[PDB]
Write a protein that binds this ligand. Structure first.
Ligand SMILES: [Mn+2]
Ligand SMILES: [Mn+2]
Ligand SMILES: [Mn+2]
Length: 203
């Protein structure tokens, strides 16, 4: 896949998130509703091999909903900067939906990314796969000071988390730019030190 490098900062409270979104209002591009679902074997074969297989269902807040399969491999997250190999592919929404219900049907899709999962992790089909479940995320996208800010409200069972992400080839310079702004505006933040998937799996 391609290498995804992104700044990842946690907004520490719902208030911090609300204040930031209000401050960024004039820079708003779009709002996305995401439902993230995850698949693995019951033995956690992908997870133990540092891989995450996501089906993301996406909808704008014509706006057909969309399903994107993502394989993320060999992630690192340190100092508020994430780097991971990401391979993505759009598939038919109805097909994605059926796979959440019946994960063995991943075997019936004909997807490039799924073929890569088979080849690299050594499966001949997805008959032994299960859905780990998922979580919703509301992503506000802003075009601010030359970057694309993605401000996330992630809704888990146990409660909500809030983050700012920014995909960039200059994460140190962009992270400093964002941090200066948050500090000036007295927004409560820290580096994120867990992926959304890891938070989800920790309960
Ligand atoms: Mn990505
Ligand atoms: Mn991210
Ligand atoms: Mn990203």
């Amino acid at each position: 896949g391609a290498m995804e490098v992104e700044v990842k900062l946690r907004l520490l409270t719902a208030a911090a998130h609300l204040r930031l979104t209000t401050l960024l209002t004039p820079y708003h591009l779009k709002t996305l509703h995401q439902r993230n679902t995850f698949f693995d074997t019951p033995k956690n074969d992908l997870s133990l091999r540092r891989a995450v297989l996501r089906l993301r269902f996406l909808q704008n807040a014509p706006s057909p909903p969309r399903c994107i399969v993502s394989l993320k491999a060999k992630p690192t997250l340190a100092n508020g900067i994430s780097r991971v190999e990401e391979d993505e592919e759009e598939i038919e929404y109805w097909i994605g939906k059926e796979c959440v219900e019946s994960p063995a049907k991943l075997s019936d899709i004909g997807s490039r990314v799924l073929k890569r999962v088979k080849e690299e992790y050594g499966f001949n089909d997805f008959l032994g796969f299960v859905c780990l479940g998922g979580f919703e995320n509301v992503r506000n996208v802003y075009e601010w000071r030359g970057v694309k800010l993605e401000v996330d409200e992630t809704k888990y069972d146990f409660g909500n988390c809030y983050e700012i992400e920014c995909e960039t080839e200059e994460p140190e310079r962009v992270k400093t730019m964002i941090e200066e702004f948050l500090t000036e505006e007295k927004i409560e933040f820290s580096n994120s030190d867990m992926t959304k998937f890891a938070v989800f799996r920790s309960g």
